[PDB]
């Protein structure tokens with residue numbers, strides 16, 4: 001049905017482009033994820049994205065690419081199957097994660113972004129939907145997915161005001177709202193909003209009354225730029241505000257101090273007396 005040995009299953013959703021299906025590797029007896037893209041699409045991207053995954057073969061928490069080709073009306077990318085997204089798991093946990101789960105996630109999510117940056121790419125759409133847990137023996141590993149909006153950042157790319165937002169407004173950095181070209185800092189500031197999102201259940205710039213699309217964006221930018229970090233993070237450990245302030249202070253072409261940021265949450269993890277056993281909130285559902 002696909003690539004001689006793959007059976008296409010049911011659609012499970014969409015990425016930044018193309019649609020994702022469940023499938024079966026018939027020869028290996030393993031479930032897989034299959035991404036489809038119309039061959040006649042005006043802006044073909046799937047083969048571009050597969051090159052990025054291929055170049056990240058072997059990275060921790062990077063999905064493995066099993067096959068990439070064309071079939072009928074589609075370009076096809078077959079991937080090892082991953083588990084639920086962090087948004088799915090957040091909902092399954094009643095939109096509340098324990099501090100321990102947030103810190104376990106933060107440690108891995110910072111490392112995933114650092115790895116992407118070490119390969120000269122910026123992700124540009126850091127959000128809960130793009131982090132998936134592994135399945136089975138890899139169920140303790142947070143994976144990052146979807147490089148459809150990713151961009152090579154290096155010789156660093158020049159300072160620019162590449163207007164218009166490509167990623168999601170909810171987690172976009174303030175500099176993105178100002179129309180500045182995204183760089184490494186912006187992936188990390190976005191992660192900072194995702195972590196407070198997990199702590200709060202929502203962000204203060206969600207659900208703002210707006211009539212049209214452009215107005216909706218204005219309201220989000222204005223609320224985000226008028227909400228002090230200390231107000232956003234009030235009631236939660238100071239490390240989250242320290243993290244966001246550090247990212248907001250980074251210069252366009254600065255290499256972030258990833259280790260410092262991981263050690264921030266690590267020291268908190270230790271002061272709480274938590275055990276680093278990968279027992280996340282959802283693992284405790286009976």
Ligand SMILES: Nc1nc2ccc(Cl)cc2c2nc(-c3ccco3)nn12
Pocket residue numbers: 012013014015020033063079080081082083084132145146
């Ligand atoms: N289970 C699953 N494994 C994957 C493995 C590799 C890659 Cl690269 C993507 C996915 C993937 N994407 C989605 C999805 C659901 C709704 C929208 O996208 N699920 N999914």
